[PDB]
Design a protein around this ligand. Structure first.
Ligand SMILES: CC(C)=CCC/C(C)=C/CC/C(C)=C/COP(=O)(O)OP(=O)(O)O
Ligand SMILES: [K+]
Ligand SMILES: [Zn+2]
Lengths: 445, 335
């Protein structure tokens, strides 16, 4: 076993309860599957192994996996019908992360989403499916990544505004589609679409929510998100549900679309309970994050949990003028080991955990999390917007480290990915360009 | 084709799929749908465009769901039809149970259930075998997020916070697996969740107050608090490294406006360490509620045990706590 691997990543935890339950059975199995991969001794693993004992990111294998993922699927994949916009997004995001120019997909993106847009506003899973905020989010982010005036022009902005206005609920949150569920993912996806398209802040004059005293898309929204915090400190999908990393990301990112992190986050969330719960998402020896208490690590939380960290850290540090920092309050080393040692599939693609087949969702979010650990992401007093703070995020590289330490970069520079915006989950330039283009278009009559 | 040959369907023309593959550039991530799914969905487009509320449309939604229960549009349209036609929703629930049992991980089914069950005209009171059905689901996956979310909704809707099956079912699940955090979270809702029907739902009391006071009860039942803390200690002793009951107890103390030091001796009994949670508990007691000389150093000692031995992956968080405590002590020393 490679000398660059600390004991922390090569042994189960010291404390072990005598009582066996299903939870500990699954936890034990997961640890046992991860250990040979963490140690770099599994026959499935490809090198080179770096000085920390970690295999290279297999860039060519993942590129080919992601390009393949954008082509045709057989009949058996029918359950993905409503997720087709996500499939486009997850692939383009992973390709961007890996350093590809995705401009050549502009026309194919336009062709895909044109049929999925409804005349009454918004984008759904495809022709004849009702508009849904997650499809719309995936489509908008895909359009941002490919760029170009022709893709930007595809969206009917006025109809999108009218439709989104129908989803605004009396309690301040959003349903995901008309007649659909209300949860924090709905609020986050709606507000990202609203921000990137520079939609008017006011609700449409005839929005039903106006009958409940609400006037704008953000009226009652941070209060709603506050009501989704739980006694554990984390944030649930809807009030009273269980704290979960995916919803913590949605709520914190949504709050950061409303003002500066150091203003909004402490105002609406109890950071005293949020911080330790977020910290407790990470396990050893696996190194990765679980989504909720007493469940298992999963590489997709490299994004959902991982990208809560720059948001929370900005809430603590405050806006940086163009200065000391709390730094990283989780283990970048552990997360990197989990992703590179445990989540890479030998044939390409990344996975939830050992024993799982890869998929493009897990590939996108494991890579997104790997990128997070490679950058300082922080907010500034300099915005591209004429949501000001949300367009003020900037980045500096956090370079690959040498030696031992509590906050180190154990990826190689050969593993470096493109930085992603921690709120918009696309490259900063892509988010900037779309927002600025729309700011400069008059709202349609 | 089944639909195209059925006289039942003759009166309506299907709308064929336009996927973008014919007009311009080739679309992305396409699926080569079966002919049966293409045909059924072409008829669905046609009936939805016509806003058709009919028995044939209802059957069509059932057929599409049998092929793809992850089609969110068809579920929403199905609910519209059920209400428009005044269908028997008891029978719809019995059918939905079968779909739920076949597709454990499907959440669309559970939103549909909430939509139906919310109709007080059809379900004025808790149906007599509804809780048993939820338990049939939890017997197969005890942490199912969508089923727990539905059960939270059900408790608020039918006002079941003090209903003995809610607490009994939580307790049966915690007997089976004391580490089931979903059951602990539901227990908190039952015992300490806000109930005021004139307020928007919230996971915690006092969300109109300062965030540091989130969770504080306006009125505390002290005997209930004692009972819940005793329960938590009893479960902890069965498996002291189980985070769930420790987090629950912190929630209880916060709701009650009681200090963590109420459990100082209990936490000390696990210190030779049987629980990392006990160590963190002591760190907070010494740092935040003990104002005596030497308490800050002891908190730092506890956090050092965590960073070096008992939860080292969280070292940067423990070090942040050490920095906070050290700064606070230095401020205290200078005033
Ligand atoms: C922008 C956007 C769409 C955000 C939401 C993303 C996220 C994945 C939503 C789902 C979260 C939750 C209900 C997972 C539980 O599934 P599980 O029980 O299978 O997983 P678990 O054991 O890890 O909790
Ligand atoms: K979704
Ligand atoms: Zn996952």
């Amino acid at each position: 076993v490679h000398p660059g691997i600390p004991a922390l990543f090569r042994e189960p935890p010291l404390i072990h309860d005598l009582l066996s339950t299903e939870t500990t059975e699954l936890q034990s199995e997961t640890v046992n599957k991860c250990l040979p991969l963490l140690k770099g001794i599994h026959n499935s693993q490809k090198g080179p192994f770096n000085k920390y004992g970690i295999p290279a990111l297999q860039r060519k294998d993942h590129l080919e996996y992601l390009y393949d993922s954008l082509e045709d699927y057989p009949a058996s994949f029918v359950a993905l019908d409503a997720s087709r916009p996500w499939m486009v997004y997850w692939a383009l995001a992973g390709l961007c992360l890996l350093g590809e120019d995705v401009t050549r997909f502009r026309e194919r993106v336009i062709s895909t989403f044109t049929a999925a847009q409804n005349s009454t506003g918004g984008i759904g899973g495809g022709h004849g499916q009702m508009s849904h905020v997650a499809s719309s989010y995936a489509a908008v982010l895909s359009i941002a990544m490919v760029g170009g005036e022709e893709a930007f022009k595809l969206i009917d902005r006025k109809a999108m505004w009218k439709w989104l206005g129908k989803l605004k609920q009396p309690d301040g949150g959003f349903t995901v589609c008309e007649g659909g569920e209300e949860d924090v993912r709905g609020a986050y996806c709606a507000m990202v679409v609203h921000a990137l398209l520079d939609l008017p802040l006011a609700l449409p004059p005839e929005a039903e929510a106006r009958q409940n005293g609400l006037e704008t898309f953000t009226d009652g929204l941070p209060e709603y998100l506050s009501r989704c915090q739980t006694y554990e400190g984390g944030i649930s999908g809807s009030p009273g549900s269980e704290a979960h990393g995916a919803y913590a990301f949605c709520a914190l990112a949504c709050l950061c679309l409303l003002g500066r992190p150091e203003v909004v986050v402490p105002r609406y969330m109890n950071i005293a309970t949020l911080l330790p719960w977020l910290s407790a998402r990470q396990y050893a020896p696996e190194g990765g994050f679980s989504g909720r208490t007493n469940k298992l690590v999963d590489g997709c939380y490299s994004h959902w949990v991982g990208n809560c960290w720059p948001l929370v850290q900005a809430a603590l540090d405050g806006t940086q003028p163009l200065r000391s920092s709390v730094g990283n309050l989780y283990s970048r080393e552990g997360l990197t080991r989990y992703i590179l040692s445990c989540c890479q599939c030998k044939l390409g693609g990344l996975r939830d955990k050992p024993g799982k087949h890869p998929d493009s969702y897990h590939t996108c979010y494991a890579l997104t999390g790997l990128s997070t650990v490679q950058y300082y992401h922080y907010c500034t007093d300099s915005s591209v917007s004429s949501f000001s703070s949300a367009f003020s995020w900037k980045h500096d590289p956090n370079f690959a480290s040498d030696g031992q330490g509590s906050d180190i970069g154990v990826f190689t520079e050969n593993d470096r990915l493109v930085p992603f915006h921690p709120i918009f989950v696309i490259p900063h330039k892509s988010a900037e360009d779309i927002r600025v283009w729309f700011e400069n278009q008059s709202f349609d009559l | 084709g089944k639909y195209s040959s059925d006289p039942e369907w003759a009166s309506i023309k299907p709308i064929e799929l336009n996927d973008g593959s014919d007009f311009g550039a080739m679309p992305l991530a396409t699926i080569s749908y079966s002919p049966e799914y293409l045909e059924a969905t072409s008829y669905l487009r046609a009936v939805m465009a016509a806003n058709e509320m009919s028995e044939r449309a209802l059957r069509l939604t059932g057929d599409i769901i049998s092929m793809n229960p992850a089609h969110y549009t068809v579920w929403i349209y199905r609910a519209k039809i059920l209400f428009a036609l005044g269908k028997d929703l008891n029978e719809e629930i019995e059918w939905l149970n079968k779909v739920a049992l076949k597709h454990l991980k499907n959440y669309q089914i559970w939103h549909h259930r909430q939509v139906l069950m919310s109709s007080r005209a059809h379900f004025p009171t808790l149906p007599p075998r509804e809780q048993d059905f939820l338990m049939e689901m939890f017997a197969q996956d005890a942490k199912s997020y969508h089923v727990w979310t539905y059960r939270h909704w059900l408790v608020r809707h039918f006002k079941l916070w003090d209903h003995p099956r809610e607490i009994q079912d939580v307790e049966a699940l915690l007997k089976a697996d004391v580490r089931n955090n979903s059951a602990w979270n539901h227990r908190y809702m039952l015992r300490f969740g806000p109930r005021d029907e004139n307020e928007f739902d919230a996971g915690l009391h006092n969300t109109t107050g300062p965030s540091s006071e989130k969770g504080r009860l306006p009125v505390v039942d002290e005997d209930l608090v004692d009972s819940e803390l005793q329960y938590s200690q009893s479960r902890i002793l069965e498996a002291p490294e189980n985070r769930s009951p420790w987090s629950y107890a912190r929630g209880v103390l916060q709701a009650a406006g009681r200090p963590l030091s109420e459990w100082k001796d209990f936490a000390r009994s696990f210190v030779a360490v049987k629980s990392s949670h006990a160590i963190e508990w002591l760190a907070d007691v010494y740092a935040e509620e003990d104002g005596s000389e030497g308490s800050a150093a002891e908190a730092v000692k506890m956090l050092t045990l965590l960073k070096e031995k008992y939860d080292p992956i969280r070292r940067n968080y423990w070090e942040y706590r050490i920095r906070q405590i050290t700064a606070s002590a230095a401020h205290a020393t200078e005033i």
